Amino acid sequence: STPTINIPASPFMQKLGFGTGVNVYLMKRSPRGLSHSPWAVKKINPICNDHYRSVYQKRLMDEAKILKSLHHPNIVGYRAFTEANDGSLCLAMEYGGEKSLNDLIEERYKASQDPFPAAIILKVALNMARGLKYLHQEKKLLHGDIKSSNVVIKGDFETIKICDVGVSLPLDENMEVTDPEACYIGTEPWKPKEAVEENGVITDKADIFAFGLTLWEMMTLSIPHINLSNDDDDEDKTFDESDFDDEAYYAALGTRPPINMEELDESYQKVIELFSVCTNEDPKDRPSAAHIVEALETA
Amino acid sequence: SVLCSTPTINIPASPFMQKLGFGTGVNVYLMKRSPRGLSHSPWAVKKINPICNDHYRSVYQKRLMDEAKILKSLHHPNIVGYRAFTEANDGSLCLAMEYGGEKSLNDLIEERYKASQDPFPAAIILKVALNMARGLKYLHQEKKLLHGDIKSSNVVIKGDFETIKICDVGVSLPLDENMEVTDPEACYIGTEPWKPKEAVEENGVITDKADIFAFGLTLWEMMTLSIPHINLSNDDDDEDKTFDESDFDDEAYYAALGTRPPINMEELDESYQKVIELFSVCTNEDPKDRPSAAHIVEALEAA
Ligand SMILES: O=C(O)/C=C/c1ccc(O)cc1
Ligand SMILES: O=C(O)/C=C/c1ccc(O)cc1
Ligand SMILES: O=C(O)/C=C/c1ccc(O)cc1
Ligand SMILES: O=C(O)/C=C/c1ccc(O)cc1
C-alpha cells in the first residue's frame, strides 16, 4: 500500500471539534512539474472558464496605455485599478449599456418579428461609422470583429457604442494590417473575403464589410449566410443542424447576403444602398469609415 | 468563379451611393423569407457566435432581479462582491464582479513554483486560511449560500497578501435550514480535482461541508504547489524536463477524486503543524467530521 502517518489528537485539532488522531497518506516529491506543464494549464482548470481573469485581463503596460486612451462617444474603453506593477496591469472593459444590438435583434424577433425601422438602422450606422473613423484615423487600429454582439445600446438607442476594441490589428500608414504577427479572425459569418483568402490583404475596409453585415442584421433579424437547407415553406417550428445548409454556408463566406426587399420597402432606400456598397466584393469599392460619416452626417 | 443562380435586382446609381464615393449601380441577390427561425434556433445560439466567447457579456452579466438583489447585497471583507450600473426595478439587471487585486492565489502558487519552489511559509497559509474561513462563514451563516467551487484560482490576493478574498460567488447553491442544498435546480459542479466525495457520488447530498473540503484542498495547494490528484505513474522518468498527458496516471486520478490527497511530509517542517491538522480534518471522507467555517474562524482566532 502507500506509506501512512498518524497525526496525534492535538488540542488545536480538538478546537475544530475533532478530537482524535488522523491517519494520512504520504508523498515524497510534489508533482509540481506535471501540474504546471502546458498540458495541465490547458486541460485542467482552463483559464477560459475562469471568471475573474475574463473580467480583469492582464495586459502589457504598452497595450494597456493604448486601451486606456480610447476616449470617444461611440467606443467602449477600458480602465485599470493600479499603476502598472512591473510588466503588466489588469484592465476591465467599461460599461456602455444593459443590452447589445444582438440582444435587441432577437428581442424583436420574438415579438414583431418586424425589421428595425430604417430611421434607427441609419442612426446605428452613423454612430458605428463615427466610432470606426476614430479607431481607423485616430488610433490607427482595426477593430476586427464588428457584429451586433460588439455593439452595446443604452436604453432606446440613447447611445450606440462599439466594444471589445483590440490592439492587435494596428493599421499601417497605408491603412493596412501589415504587422507580421497580426491575424484577422472576427466571427466566421461576418468575415470579409480577404479574411478567408487564407492569404488576402487585411485593409481598414475589413471593418466596413462587417459594419455592413451588422446593418443587414437589423434588416433581416438573421445571421449572415445561415439559410434552411430545405425550406418546406418554413414548415416545422423547430430547427437544428439537420435543416441547416452546410453547403451554402461555407460557400458564401465573404459575400454579400441576399437582401429581403420583399419584407422591407421604400424608406429603407439609403439603408440598402449603404449596406450594398459596404459589402461590395472588392475592398477599394467599399467606403472609408470617414466617407460613411459625412456621407451620412447632414447628407 | 462558381457562384449560383437566384433572383437578383439592380439598385440604380443614386446621389447617395455617389456621395459614398461610388456613383454607379449595384446588383444584389434576393431573398423572400428571412431565416429568422433557424438563426435563433437553440442550435444556432450554441454553435454560432457562442455567447461563452463574448467579451462584453463576460463582465457585464444579466441577472434576474431577485438574484441581483442577493449578489448586490454581498458585503464582506473577504468576499468579492458585485456592482450594478443602472437603477433596477425591471426584471433583469447587469452586474459586474468587483475588483480585489491583480493576482489570484493560483497565480502566486505558480510564480512561487517558477522560482523558490518552496511551499508558502506556514504563517502565510494560516493567514489565507483564516480569511477564507471568515468569508466562507459569511456565505454559509449570513447569506445561506454554498460557494460552489473553492480553489486557488477563485481566491484573489491584493498586493503582498494585504488582502485575501473569495470570488465568483453565485446564488444557485442555496443552503437549507438544515445546511444542505436541496433546491431541485441546484447542482454542485466545482472543478474536478477539487470535488468532495459528496459531489463525486452519483447522488450524494451537498452540505456547507462540501466547501470546507475544497477549502482544505486549497491549503494543500499552498504546501505542494500542485493540483490535487494529478500524479505521474512514472516515478521513474520523473524529473524529465517536460511533461505530457502521457505521464499522467489517468486511473489514479478518477480513482482519487473526492479523497484526501497525500501530504509531502518531507518537504515541510514543524511550523506546518497547525496547517497540516487543518488540512486533515477539512478533508475527512465524512462531512460530519469536517469543521464548519465558523469553527475554523474560532480555532484560528485562537485564544
Ligand atoms: O474541471 C476542470 O477544470 C477540469 C476537468 C478535467 C477533466 C478531466 C481531465 O483529465 C482533466 C481536467
Ligand atoms: O464603466 C464604468 O463606469 C465602470 C466600469 C467598471 C468595471 C469594472 C469595475 O470593477 C468597476 C467599474
Ligand atoms: O465563430 C463563430 O462564432 C462560429 C463558428 C462556427 C463554426 C462552424 C459552424 O458550423 C458554425 C459556427
Ligand atoms: O449597487 C451598485 O453597485 C450600483 C447601484 C447603482 C444604483 C443606481 C445607479 O444609477 C447606478 C448604480
Swiss-Prot record, chain B:
Similarity remark: Belongs to the protein kinase superfamily. STE Ser/Thr protein kinase family. MAP kinase kinase subfamily.
Post-translational modification (record): Phosphorylated; in a cell-cycle dependent manner at mitosis.
GO molecular function, one term: protein tyrosine kinase activity
Domain Protein kinase: residue ranges: 14-301
Binding site for ATP: 20-28, 46
InterPro entries documented for this protein: Kinase-like_dom_sf, PKc_TOPK, Prot_kinase_dom, Ser/Thr_kinase_AS
Record's subunit section: Interacts with DLG1 and TP53.
UniProt name for this protein: Lymphokine-activated killer T-cell-originated protein kinase
Residues recorded with modification Phosphoserine: 14, 41
Its job: Phosphorylates MAP kinase p38. Seems to be active only in mitosis. May also play a role in the activation of lymphoid cells. When phosphorylated, forms a complex with TP53, leading to TP53 destabilization and attenuation of G2/M checkpoint during doxorubicin-induced DNA damage.
Residues of the active site: 149
Regulation: Activated by phosphorylation.
Keyword annotations: Acetylation, ATP-binding, Isopeptide bond, Kinase, Nucleotide-binding, Phosphoprotein, Serine/threonine-protein kinase, Transferase, Ubl conjugation
EC code(s) of this entry: 2.7.12.2
Gene Ontology BP terms: cellular response to UV; mitotic cell cycle; negative regulation of inflammatory response; negative regulation of proteasomal ubiquitin-dependent protein catabolic process; negative regulation of stress-activated MAPK cascade; proteasome-mediated ubiquitin-dependent protein catabolic process; stress-activated MAPK cascade
